[PDB]
RNA sequence: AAACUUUCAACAACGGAUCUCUUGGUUCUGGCAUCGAUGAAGAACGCAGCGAAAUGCGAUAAGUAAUGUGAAUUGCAGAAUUCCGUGAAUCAUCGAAUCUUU
RNA sequence: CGCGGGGUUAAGGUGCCGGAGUGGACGCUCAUCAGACUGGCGCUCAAGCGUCCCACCCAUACCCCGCCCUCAGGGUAGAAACGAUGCCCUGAGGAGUAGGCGGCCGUGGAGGUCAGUGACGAAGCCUAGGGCGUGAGCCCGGGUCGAACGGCCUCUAGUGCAGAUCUUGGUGGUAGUAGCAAAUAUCUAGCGAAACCACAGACCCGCACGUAGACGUAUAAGAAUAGGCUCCGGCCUCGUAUCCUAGCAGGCGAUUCCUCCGCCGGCCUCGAAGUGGCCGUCGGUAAUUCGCGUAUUGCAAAGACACGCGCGGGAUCAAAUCAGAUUUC
RNA sequence: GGGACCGAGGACCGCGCUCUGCAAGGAUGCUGGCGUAAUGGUCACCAGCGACCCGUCUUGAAACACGGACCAAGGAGUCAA
RNA sequence: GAGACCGAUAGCGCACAAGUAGAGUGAUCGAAAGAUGAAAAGCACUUUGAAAAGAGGGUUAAAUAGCACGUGAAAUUGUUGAAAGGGAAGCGCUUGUGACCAGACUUGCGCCCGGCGGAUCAUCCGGUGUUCUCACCGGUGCACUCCGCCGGGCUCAGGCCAG
C-alpha cells in the first residue's frame, strides 16, 4: 500500500496558535502567505520593516487595486499594500513560537516557517460583519545531513 | 472442488449508473435517478447525445440475477442459526455478516460457515489471526 | 509503521552493524524484552559506520527508530546538551550529535510471552509466561514495561 | 520560469443539519366547587453577607407561631446552633398571628 | 423507437473536412466575383451540367442470434423432485402529452413475530473502497461515534421537493470595492457596505528517476510534355527501378579476401536555415569453405557497474533588480 | 476454398440418415497460460464523435415573458357530514 | 389519570430570563435562546505575553468531551499534495495515461494395503424414558461387520482466459 509522508518529530518542531483574533482575514492571509517558507529572522525583519514603513506586502488572490509602486518589483505583483495590525499579530505569534522552541530545546538560529494557516473565526454579531481569524503556524529546524560511511567487504 | 454452481456467463447490459439530469451542476440535486417530467426536456424526448433513461430492456438474465462475480448470491446473516440455513445451499449462496454483528459472534459465524462449506464475503472484518 | 521513504529528509542504511540503545527497561518483563531484542543483534557493532538502532520504552510503548549520527562541533546559536537530572553534560560542552533517520519508525507493545513456539507448542502449566490484558492498564500510572 | 484560475484527496475552519434524549406542549377522561369593603384581581416599593435573575415574604419582611418527621443547609463564607433532643432543616403539614403604598 | 452482436439497405452520398470512386462511356460550358442534383476549402478533358453502367458507405429501418418485460396459446394430482398466488413449453409485440390501471422502493408511529442486532459498540455522519437491483433503492468494508436499533406479516399517517419574486437559519461573488455618511481636494493607516447574481460574453554533502508514434523509417539538378536522355553504339508507357539484405537480437576457432563500414588527426570543402570528399592511424569485416555452441523458453500470449536529466542545503564565477538585500544556467 | 460473428438449452424421449454410429430436437476435443497479480474498479487528464438552460404559460408552431446567488430544514387534494 | 399525539424551524407565542428582552404617543405588537462529563475530577504548576490567546504539563475511559463544551452534514474558507488551462466551462458514448484500491476455485472426494481405537458389531448382561417399538446410558470383548485416526500407494474431479 501507499504510506503518507510521516510528520516530523515533535522534538524538532514548535507550534504557535492564536484564536478568535480581531484582525481582518484577507490581509492576515496575504501577510502569512508572503512570509510562508522563509527563515525566521528574515520574517522577523520583514514584519518589523512593514510595521514601520519600508517594505510592501503583495496581494495575489484577495488583491485590491490600492498601490502601484516599485516595492512590488521583487515579488512580480503590480498590486502591493501594507497591512499593519496583521503584522503585529504575526509578530506576536512568531515570538510565541520562538519562546516555545527555546523552552523545548531547539536551535533558534536554524528555525524556518514550515507552515502558516489562517482560517476564518466566528463572525462578530453586532448589517456590518467583522471578519476575525485563527492563525496556526509551525516552525521547524533546518534539515540535518550526515555523511555516510563506506560499506565493508564480506 | 468447492466453488459456486455451474451457471451461464454473467452478462451486465450496462455497468454505469443512471444519473439524474442536471445533478452534476446543482449540489441540491442528488444523483439518484428521477424521471424528467417536462415537455421540452430533451432527456425525456430522447434526443441524440443526451442521457439514457432506465428501461426494462436493460434487465439482467433471470439465471444470473442477484449473482456475485463469484457466482453466489448474497445471504445476510446476523447469527450462527442464519448460516445453518445454508447447509443445503452452500454452492448457491454466500454469507454476508451484518454490519452490527459483534466480533465474537462474527468469529462464531466464520468458523461454522467454513465447516458448512459456505463462502463469507466479509471475513476480513474486526478479527485477526493469533499464532 | 512508516518505511524509510515516508520519512522526510531520510537516508539509506549501509551494511555496518548498528549499536543498540535499549532505554528505560526496569521491570523483569522489561528486562526480558530488552534481552530478547539484544540477542537478535550482533554484540560487537562495527563502529566505522555510525549507525544506531534505538528501542526506547516509554509508558509501556517501545518506540523503534534507526538513525545515523556524527559527532560535530556546535554551531554558536546551539545550546549545550542538558544532562539527566542536572544540566551541563561534563566533557561534551560544545559537542553535539547530528542525527539522520535511515530506518523505519515503528511502535511496539509487548502482548504475550510464551514458553514454546506460540500457544501451540507450549505444553505444561507454565504454558504462557505473560499475557497482556486491558484491565492491567486500568490506571494510567501502571506500566508493565 | 513564477503568479493566477479550475478539479480531486488529507487535515484544519465556518455553520448547526442528522441521530439519540426531554422536570415542556397538546388532546382526552375522572373527582370536586373555593375570590372581594374581615379589602380581591392587578400595580409599586422594600426584606439576604456576597443577589445579578427567578421565587418567597412584608418594618414580626428568602419570614414568626403551632403540628409532624427526625439530623441537616449547602456555590462560597460564619455559628460555642443542634444530636438519647419540645429538636437541625432553602423540610413537610398548617387550624394562630404579622401583613408597607396603591 | 426495449438492451446488445453480426449482415444488408432506404433517403442521401463516394476531392478534403467526412465513411465510401480524383470510377467508367458520350458531348457541352471559361462566366471582371460561372455553375454545383455547392456549408467551408476549393474545383474547369470538374470536384459543373444531361443520360447510361459498375462497385462501394451507413439509420433506432429489414434479416439471423442472444437477453429483459408484456400479452396470448398450451401442459402440470390416487400431486410435483419450485410458495398451482408455483413450475414447464411455444409464439407475437415494445414511441408517447393530458389521462387510466398495476406492481414495487422509502419515512414517522401501532399489534404480532424473528427465543433478531447491540457498550467485545446501537443510531447518526464521512469515505480518489466492495457488491446487488432496469430503477426508486438496498447490503457489506474503512474511519468517526457513544445508547439504542432493524427485518418480515398486518395497521395507521402531519409519509417522499429543484422551483412557488416560497418560510426560517446559515453562507458567498460583487469587494477589502464604493466610501469615512444614521448605527458601529489628493495619498496613506484603521473601518467598511449595497443594488445585482442560471451559467458566460564549476565543486562539496544527502536524495530521486531513466516520443501525434523508428524497425532498411537508404535514393538531390533542371527543363519540356507537338519531346527529352546518350557511352554517339544507341535509349524512353511502366520507381513493377537502384543500393543493401547470411552469422546467439547474430558467438568462438579456422580456411580465405584486401572488399566494405565506423572512430580520430592532416589537406581542403560547405552560409540559405552549414556539411561532405581525399589521405593516414586503429577496430570490426563469409567474396569461398568448415569444426564447434543456439534445445526442457518444451504448439504464439527484483543483482552490480557506467552515463545522463533533476532536486534540498553550502560557497564558487559573471550579471540583473532594489557599500547592502534578493534572483539567475 | 478463404473470412467474420455467435454456442442459446442441459439425463433419455422426436424426425431421420451415408445405420458396428452420424454433421440427425442449439460445442465439444486437444494444448498452453493464471496469485510480488489474472482481472476489475475509482479519481484526474488527454483524445475521436455527439449534445441549444431547467420549470411554468401562451401560440398552428416558434419567438417573448415569469422564476432561478448557494446550501440545510420546513413546504401544498386533508378531515368530517 | 391517561394517549397508535409533537419532539426544540415541531409541540402553546413561551421546555431556558417569556407575555420576558425589544418596538410603538397609545390602543397594541412581540422574539430568539435546550444537551460537558458517571462524577467538576471545570486544566494545578513551569514558561511566552496585556489576548474571550499559546507551548509544555496535568484530570479523565476519552479533552480531535475544556462551561466556544454529546454527535458534528452541506453551502463557504485556509494549509499541503497532484493534474490541467488562458478566444466559456459543465454533459453522453468509447479507448488510452498516471495515481490509488481490491484480490480470482471457499481450491476436494474416492478406492487398495498395514497398525491403532471405538461402535449402531455381540442373537452378551443390567438400567432409564417412550409415540411400546423405538431411542438413551453403564459394563464387557474384537470371531464377523461398520466407522473413524495414523503411515504408505493409485486413480479421478476441479474456476477463468487464449490458440
Automatic annotation (TrEMBL), chain A:
GO cellular component term, pick one: cytosolic large ribosomal subunit
GO terms of molecular function: structural constituent of ribosome
Pfam family membership, one: Ribosomal_L22
InterPro entries given in the database record: Ribosomal_uL22, Ribosomal_uL22_CS, Ribosomal_uL22_euk/arc, Ribosomal_uL22_sf
UniProt-listed GO biological process terms: cytoplasmic translation
PANTHER family, per the entry: 60S RIBOSOMAL PROTEIN L17
Sequence similarity: Belongs to the universal ribosomal protein uL22 family.
The protein, known as: Large ribosomal subunit protein uL22
Protein source organism: Chaetomium thermophilum (strain DSM 1495 / CBS 144.50 / IMI 039719) (Thermochaetoides thermophila)
Taxonomic path: Eukaryota, Fungi, Dikarya, Ascomycota, Pezizomycotina
Automatic annotation (TrEMBL), chain B:
One Pfam family linked to the record: Ribosomal_L32e
SUPFAM superfamilies: Ribosomal protein L32e
InterPro entries: Ribosomal_eL32 (IPR001515), Ribosomal_eL32_sf (IPR036351)
Molecular function as annotated in GO: structural constituent of ribosome
GO BP, sorted A to Z: translation
SMART domains in UniProt: Ribosomal_L32e (SM01393)
Keywords associated with the record: Metal-binding, Ribonucleoprotein, Ribosomal protein
Cellular component, GO, one term: cytosolic large ribosomal subunit
CDD domains named in the record: Ribosomal_L32_L32e
Residues where Mg(2+) binds: 40
Family of the protein in this entry: Belongs to the eukaryotic ribosomal protein eL32 family.
Name of the protein this chain belongs to: 60S ribosomal protein L32-like protein
Species of provenance: Chaetomium thermophilum (strain DSM 1495 / CBS 144.50 / IMI 039719) (Thermochaetoides thermophila)
Lineage, uppermost ranks: Eukaryota, Fungi, Dikarya, Ascomycota, Pezizomycotina
UniProtKB/TrEMBL annotation, chain C:
Signal peptide as annotated in the record: none
Name under which the protein is recorded: Brix domain-containing protein
Gene source species: Chaetomium thermophilum (strain DSM 1495 / CBS 144.50 / IMI 039719)
Amino acid at each position: 500500500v501507499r504510506y503518507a509522508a510521516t510528520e516530523i518529530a515533535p522534538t524538532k518542531s514548535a507550534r504557535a496558535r492564536g484564536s478568535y483574533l480581531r484582525v481582518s482575514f484577507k490581509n492576515t492571509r496575504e501577510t502569512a502567505q508572503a512570509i510562508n517558507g522563509w527563515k525566521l529572522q528574515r520574517a522577523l525583519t520583514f514584519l518589523q520593516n512593514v510595521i514601520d514603513k519600508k517594505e510592501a506586502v503583495p496581494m495575489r488572490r484577495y488583491a485590491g487595486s490600492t498601490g502601484r509602486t516599485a516595492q512590488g518589483k521583487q515579488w512580480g505583483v503590480s498590486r502591493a499594500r501594507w497591512p499593519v495590525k496583521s503584522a503585529q499579530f504575526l509578530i506576536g505569534l512568531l515570538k510565541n513560537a520562538e519562546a516555545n522552541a527555546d523552552a523545548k530545546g531547539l536551535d533558534t538560529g536554524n528555525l524556518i516557517i514550515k507552515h502558516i494557516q489562517v482560517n476564518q473565526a466566528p463572525k462578530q454579531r453586532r448589517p456590518y460583519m467583522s471578519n476575525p481569524c485563527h492563525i496556526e503556524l509551525i516552525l521547524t529546524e533546518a534539515e540535518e545531513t550526515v555523511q555516510k560511511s563506506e560499506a565493508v567487504v564480506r | 472442488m468447492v466453488a459456486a454452481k455451474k451457471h451461464v456467463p454473467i452478462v451486465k447490459k450496462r455497468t454505469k449508473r443512471f444519473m439524474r439530469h442536471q445533478s452534476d451542476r446543482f449540489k441540491c440535486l442528488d444523483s439518484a435517478w428521477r424521471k424528467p417530467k417536462g415537455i421540452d426536456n430533451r432527456v425525456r424526448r430522447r434526443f441524440k447525445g443526451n442521457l439514457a433513461m432506465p428501461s426494462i430492456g436493460y434487465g439482467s438474465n433471470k439465471k444470473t440475477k442477484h449473482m456475485m462475480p463469484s457466482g453466489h448470491k448474497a445471504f445476510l446473516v446476523h447469527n450462527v442459526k442464519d448460516v445453518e440455513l445454508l447447509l443445503m445451499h452452500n454452492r448457491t449462496y454466500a454469507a454476508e455478516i451484518a454490519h452490527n454483528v459483534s466480533s465474537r459472534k462474527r468469529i462464531d459465524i466464520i468458523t461454522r460457515a467454513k465447516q458448512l462449506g459456505v463462502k463469507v464475503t466479509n471475513a476480513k472484518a474486526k478479527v485477526t489471526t493469533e499464532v | 509503521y512508516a518505511p524509510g521513504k515516508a520519512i522526510p529528509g531520510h537516508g539509506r542504511a549501509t551494511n555496518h552493524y548498528p549499536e543498540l540503545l535499549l532505554n528505560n527497561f526496569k521491570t523483569p518483563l522489561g528486562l526480558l524484552a530488552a534481552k530478547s531484542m539484544h540477542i537478535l543483534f550482533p554484540s560487537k557493532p562495527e563502529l566505522a559506520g555510525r549507525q544506531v538502532v534505538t528501542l526506547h520504552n516509554q509508558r509501556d510503548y517501545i518506540f523503534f527508530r534507526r538513525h545515523r549520527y556524527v559527532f560535530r562541533e556546535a554551531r554558536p546559536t546551539e545550546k549545550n546538551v542538558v544532562g539527566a537530572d542536572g544540566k551541563e553534560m561534563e566533557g561534551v560542552k560544545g559537542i553535539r550529535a547530528g542525527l539522520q533517520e535511515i530506518g523505519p519508525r515503528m511502535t511496539l507493545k509487548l502482548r504475550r510471552v510464551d514458553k514454546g513456539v506460540g500457544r501451540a507448542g507450549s505444553e505444561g502449566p507454565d504454558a504462557v509466561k505473560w499475557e497482556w490484558k486491558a484491565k492491567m492498564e486500568k490506571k494510567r500510572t501502571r506500566f508493565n514495561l
